[PDB]
Ligand binder design. Structure first.
Ligand SMILES: *C\C=C(C)/C=C/C=C(C)/C=C/C1=C(C)CCCC1(C)C
Ligand SMILES: *C\C=C(C)/C=C/C=C(C)/C=C/C1=C(C)CCCC1(C)C
Ligand SMILES: *C\C=C(C)/C=C/C=C(C)/C=C/C1=C(C)CCCC1(C)C
Lengths: 229, 229, 229
């Protein structure tokens, strides 16, 4: 209770936890080998996020970086959460549109750089260099969104009509959800510094619960998975 | 020779090393594409364990964590060893019962959390929080054992009779081997503190050599691999 | 500009960057599902290397290790670069010769140990132990080269004649490129100390640009990829 933002981490931790339990219950009873894959990916994301927000809650996922003339606290576990949950989400979009292996490796590789670089910028002690990694990270995001908004839209339209319009929904969601992250980072205390830490923790918590529980609720509640029967 | 438990790490290092050489020799001459997979998984485990026990032996895989009112030394490499060797073992059980892709990702993901959380608890400076991560880690173990003792038992019985009864043996082994770890951790100096460090290093070495050399001796010496010929 | 070797890291960073852009442009327009895989692997390598050399350039990928009686600076990001780019290259050789899954896991697992151990030796504070990990790492290299120079040569000769002679070229390249690394490490300031740091940074930069841009230029400019048409 020593931090003026533990409520957001506490709320997030609970939201990830209960979100994992629902996917556990709702995921029990699935026999379709193609559907069980989507339920394995989607349930593990909040499982990861729950362990990550509990570490930030207890203070383990927190460290100090001397930049900007202050000892700004950096929730590194936040980026670690993203490092693990983003590639799983990309795997949901891939398996839905039945993307070839090549395309999948590119998106995953670009995603790791986006999170890898992003974390460097967040730990960079030189204030000016922080945004250099931000520019790199953000560019890596635009590539991922490019193949998602343009590469998979055609393949999905050529896929089943159950998964065609279903991908269009998650596409628009992904375009706007991912875009919010570099924005919140930039205005946050880690980037420009216009928004204080506690509000930064809140906006990022909202994005996380949306992109780790909400997003999952759209997929699993859609018959675009399973088999044609 | 400055530590009263280097003998256990030294003995372990040798046992992992010689265990890797046997699997190297015995694994030479395998042409079956399905059998070579099992020999690649099973041989790399002690290869990893050997490098990990040598680091603890030389002192590289060791660090101090201020918890419980003492500077308790924590062999982090121990958990890193588990982080790398457990998913390979799970891959042996998977390929033997021919488990679908979905099931494999769940077990691997749960396994990473079990080891990930477990390591946090081992590095936690707040003594009370150490067991919170223990509870999480142990729960993650029960899930893995649940799908192994119940999920794969039916699929194995429906698989070949060579691999059916063969999985039943490794199943009983896995149930009891994995269970011993959270127990040794809890009574060890990292958890409750009833057992001193050096005896903790011993019990964990026994488990490691069993679960990284012994376990491998049961699989490779079983015709449940190879092809039906 | 505070380091007498930033020119080599700066030059490397630019060479990785522009190398990534060419593979981006040249990789645009590929529709063959088998060819897109090779273009995804080969383009991500310098993408990784570019982010890694920029971190060493800005100083982020640098740390001090007290060994040999001095505070020798260790570019850990250098090894991290190798940790990520080597398995991708091995995947190029694998997919070209259509190596079975088993063989691929062995090479990747051995590769991780080679880089994993190598990094330990580079961070080892005891000077004598540094070469113990070197011996282990180098041995792990000889295994990788053994399966490449002997294991895949027969399979490639039995593969397409487009990919048969093409693998023979990359084979001879790989044998000599990989061999140079443990040599440069040994004579460098991290090993024996015969060569100063700045020249060490240069020889390793040359190897990196060759093995991350040059090597990629040989594969993508070869019709051994694509489909038989
Ligand atoms: C938690 C779920 C998702 C989809 C999270 C996505 C996060 C990002 C795309 C974050 C990207 C970053 C950028 C582009 C630049 C600053 C560093 C960030 C990691 C925040
Ligand atoms: C070395 C081979 C195997 C199979 C090792 C398995 C280790 C575990 C299942 C350990 C689990 C832990 C738990 C459940 C709680 C405390 C932290 C541990 C990592 C020891
Ligand atoms: C950047 C591209 C490639 C192929 C790099 C390969 C690097 C190695 C094979 C390095 C091996 C090492 C050995 C064998 C011993 C000292 C530590 C090293 C990592 C340099």
């Amino acid at each position: 209770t020593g931090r003026p933002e533990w409520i957001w981490l506490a709320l997030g931790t609970a939201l990830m936890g209960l979100g994992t339990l629902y996917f556990l219950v709702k995921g029990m009873g699935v026999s379709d080998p193609d559907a069980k894959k989507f339920y394995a990916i989607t349930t593990l994301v909040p499982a990861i996020a729950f362990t990550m927000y509990l570490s930030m809650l207890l203070g383990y996922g927190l460290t100090m970086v001397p930049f900007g003339g202050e000892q700004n606290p950096i929730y590194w576990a936040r980026y670690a959460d993203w490092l693990f949950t983003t590639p799983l989400l990309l795997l949901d979009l891939a398996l839905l549109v039945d993307a070839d292996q090549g395309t999948i490796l590119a998106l995953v590789g670009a995603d790791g750089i986006m999170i890898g670089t992003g974390l460097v910028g967040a730990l960079t002690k030189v204030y000016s260099y922080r945004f250099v990694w931000w520019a790199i990270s953000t560019a890596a995001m635009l590539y991922i969104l490019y193949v998602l908004f343009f590469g998979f839209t055609s393949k999905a339209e050529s896929m089943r009509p159950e998964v065609a319009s279903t991908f269009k929904v998650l596409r628009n969601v992904t375009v706007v959800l991912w875009s919010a992250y570099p924005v919140v980072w930039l205005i946050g205390s880690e980037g420009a510094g216009i928004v204080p830490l506690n509000i930064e923790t809140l906006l990022f918590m909202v994005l996380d619960v949306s992109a780790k529980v909400g997003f999952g609720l759209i997929l699993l509640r859609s018959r675009a998975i399973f088999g044609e029967a």
